[PDB]
Design a protein around this ligand. Structure first.
Ligand code: HEM
Ligand code: HEM
Ligand SMILES: Cc1cc(N)nc(C[C@@H]2CNC[C@@H]2OCCCCCc2ccccn2)c1
Ligand SMILES: Cc1cc(N)nc(C[C@@H]2CNC[C@@H]2OCCCCCc2ccccn2)c1
Ligand SMILES: C[C@H](O)[C@H](O)[C@H]1CNc2nc(N)[nH]c(=O)c2N1
Ligand SMILES: C[C@H](O)[C@H](O)[C@H]1CNc2nc(N)[nH]c(=O)c2N1
Ligand SMILES: [Zn+2]
Lengths: 411, 407
């Protein structure tokens, strides 16, 4: 079967066949679309088909499909599964797998970059201290003094589900949040619960507006342990505005390295529950969401106050005006300090070129419009006008529950 | 079977049961989401009529009453003997209001119960259609104090006698292709303008020429009529700060009046049902003015502002966007023509969603259309999970008549 998508600005029509290789569920049915819902131990029986489907894809990609090496590898994996109930990936397969999980991540606008991913194999790690060392090395490598390089660090896979490796942090670098007795929040309101856990675990909180959180690291299903990332490895950018000299006195800064650490990587039926990965920011992630969401730093009013905008009526568009200036500030600040960042025009234009290339060479590119369209200036980016098809391919990155909800405390 | 939607800003969780009543298909499957795609007999008719009459009698708290049973009976007999049926005025009004209530792509539905319904089922000719439409235009415009209205022409019969308004909206501007290779006017209306010219319209060949109506009665060949110029309320666009803005020579019309959709009520199909409300400012300032395939004015505005257009990262497009949108809202407000900004409209929609959840068990909403085309996440609807599903009565897309029609 063939499915078409249309760009309503260019009238370019593309044809998707790749969707035929999807087997996992979307959440939608013929009677309901759940496109805007944020969240819509394996047996031997389920495992070998998943391994075989993956190894078939891997051997096809290297133009060795049906070879003796391919057949030998299927046999080797089959035997390993029946003998040990699981199997181990070759390094080549792991690298291919991680790259493909990124290529398949339908909510990621940055995928033009997917084939350039440094994979750090941390499957020989056994302790939380060992995890800390791997993560420091990842941060230093990825940061590269501001010339950011995409990377992923992959810790041992799930075995019985009782021995999981997990990074409890949702990203490697994030700022603490503290709920005050008066109901206000100091720092980042997104991280209040996790900050409370860190403190309970023994972290000495500085209690400021941009305190970098400690890592809370779980190895082999043991209770997690706290570590402080060496501050010299945490690159940060003070935020200033090219025309407005009062902007610096808002005292804003952000970290350069966006590093998602709470997702589960599935490759060939194996589950990598600790697989922190990093790229670089698109400016709106910081300037629109982190700064201006009502439930985050929430700086819109204070900025618009300083700009002396007419704030008596929403129809003056004061919030929109202040929004643009904050985002100019973020891009200017990162660029001035030579820390990699991409604006939403550049990133979306590149994504459309990537998507068209994927259609032509791969037969499709699953994309979640709800997440791909930037959270400001939607229709002046080309992705707003692009029809997309959202479906699930493996290898993949998946959401998993926060570990404090499921962890069996040993004591 | 029972579904939750969460707002991620407020943590408020709502439970949707209303979706179980849905009957029509979304385009999605368990394998593929098509959320972002713009376009994804006697025996058939009585179940549709019954489903509708049941909801109607429920709504007036007479479900299972003698008058309910008698009406089902009457309608059954009428379909059996005539192959169709006629709605009571009360049913027609209820159905039209509910089609709007069910419109999952409409952010303005807090307003749904305040709809003036003009019953034009007695109309027989295109001149009649013109009269009804001028009256709708004048009523809805109300010298700038706009009032929501719909005018409902006769229902589909055998499908060879369709009433259609060929125009996509009652009021739109002509588009013409130039020797220059460029487009004069609205590029969205080139084909339609050409049909107009070929049918006899003499075009002024300007940038903002109000198109004539092309009206089709009783499956006849469509005829041309110019809407009295004095009934078309237009707004010159100026900026409260930029003195130069007025010299771009921009204007827009006050009355958004969709005329190309099909109203389905109780299985009956109303192929000409132009309806109107009032504008959300982004519709004109972001989409009509700044779409690359529309008036595409961003470049000109940015230049008069003297922005650095060297790099995308100076956010020059974004700055100019906000200013164009400020000017649209200012111009409409100064001339006292009803308009709503995207903050106010989306705030109202959230309130309406909560009302619908509390009172009806849900609200079908298409997030892709509901979230405004600028400043998405600083409006509350961005953070609101929505479930999209199709309820009847409904407004549906239908093929442009010029492909369908045989002359
Ligand atoms: C290289 C520069 C990159 C850019 C500019 C970029 C851009 C983005 C943006 C803007 C989002 C949405 C974020 C949000 O709204 O919270 C996102 C999501 C995501 N990206 Fe990327 N990305 C990059 C690299 C990567 C890498 C290296 C990976 C993994 C190898 C990745 C995988 C993902 C995944 C799985 C999501 C969904 C996250 C979720 O559901 O929470 N991206 N990307
Ligand atoms: C009263 C003020 C109203 C406001 C502020 C409003 C708001 C909007 C907006 C902003 C859109 C998106 C349009 C686009 O992006 O092209 C829309 C779509 C729509 N609205 Fe409304 N609306 C109003 C009245 C109405 C009325 C009176 C009806 C029917 C009686 C209606 C039914 C629809 C339908 C069916 C759509 C989808 C149209 C399509 O798919 O082309 N709305 N609404
Ligand atoms: C409940 C939930 C589900 C899900 N799939 N994903 C999340 C992630 C949350 C949603 N809101 C905030 C947070 O997003 C984290 C930031 C993602 C950074 C992605 C990125 C990666 C690399 C480069 C640039 N950007 C939460
Ligand atoms: C192909 C297609 C499908 C569809 N469902 N609807 C349309 C209508 C198209 C979609 N983009 C442009 C045009 O929309 C017309 C503008 C509708 C105005 C709606 C409105 C109605 C009332 C108040 C304010 N606004 C087109
Ligand atoms: C409810 C809704 O799906 C939610 O707010 C989504 C919308 N689109 C998004 N898009 C991105 N990139 N990131 C997000 O967190 C979200 N949040
Ligand atoms: C392809 C995509 O569905 C298309 O550009 C949509 C997106 N959201 C929209 N939202 C509204 N309100 N109106 C539109 O015309 C569109 N166009
Ligand atoms: Zn869907």
């Amino acid at each position: 079967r063939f499915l078409k998508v249309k760009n309503w600005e260019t009238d370019v029509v593309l044809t998707d066949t790749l969707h035929l290789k999807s087997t996992l569920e979307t959440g939608c049915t013929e009677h309901i679309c759940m496109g805007s819902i944020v969240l819509p131990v394996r047996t031997k029986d389920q495992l070998f088909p998943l391994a075989k489907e993956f190894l078939d894809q891997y051997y096809s990609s290297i133009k060795r499909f049906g070879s003796k090496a391919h057949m030998d590898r299927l046999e080797e994996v089959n035997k390993e599964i029946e003998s040990t109930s699981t199997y181990q990936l070759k390094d080549t397969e792991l690298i291919y797998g991680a790259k493909h999980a990124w290529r398949n991540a339908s909510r990621c606008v940055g995928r033009i970059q997917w084939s350039k991913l440094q994979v750090f194999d941390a499957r020989d790690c056994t302790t939380a201290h060992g995890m800390f060392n791997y993560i420091c090395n990842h941060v230093k490598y990825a940061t590269n003094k501001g010339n950011l390089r995409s990377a992923i660090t992959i810790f041992p896979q799930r075995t019985d589900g009782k021995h999981d490796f997990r990074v409890w942090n949702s990203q490697l670098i994030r700022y603490a949040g503290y709920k005050q007795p008066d109901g206000s929040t100091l720092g980042d309101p997104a991280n209040v619960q996790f900050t409370e856990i860190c403190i309970q675990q023994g972290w000495k909180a500085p209690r400021g507006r941009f305190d970098v959180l400690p890592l809370l690291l779980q190895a082999n299903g043991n209770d997690p342990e706290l570590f402080q990332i060496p501050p010299e490895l945490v690159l940060e950018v003070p935020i200033r505005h090219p025309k407005f000299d009062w902007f610096k006195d808002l005292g804003l800064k952000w970290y350069g390295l966006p590093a998602v650490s709470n997702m589960l990587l599935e490759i060939g039926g194996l589950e990598f529950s600790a697989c922190p990965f990093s790229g670089w920011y698109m400016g709106t992630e910081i300037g629109v969401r982190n700064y201006c969401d009502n439930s985050r730093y929430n700086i819109l009013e204070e900025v618009a106050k300083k700009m002396d905008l007419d704030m008596r009526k929403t129809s003056s568009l004061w919030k929109d005006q202040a929004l643009v200036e904050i985002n100019i500030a973020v891009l200017y600040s990162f660029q001035s300090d030579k820390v990699t960042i991409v604006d939403h025009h550049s990133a979306t234009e590149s994504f459309i070129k990537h998507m068209e290339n994927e259609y032509r060479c791969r037969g499709g590119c699953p994309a979640d419009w709800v997440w791909i369209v930037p959270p400001m200036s939607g229709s002046i980016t080309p992705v707003f006008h692009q029809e997309m098809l959202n479906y699930r391919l493996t290898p993949s990155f998946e959401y998993q529950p926060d570990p404090w909800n499921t962890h069996v405390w040993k004591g």
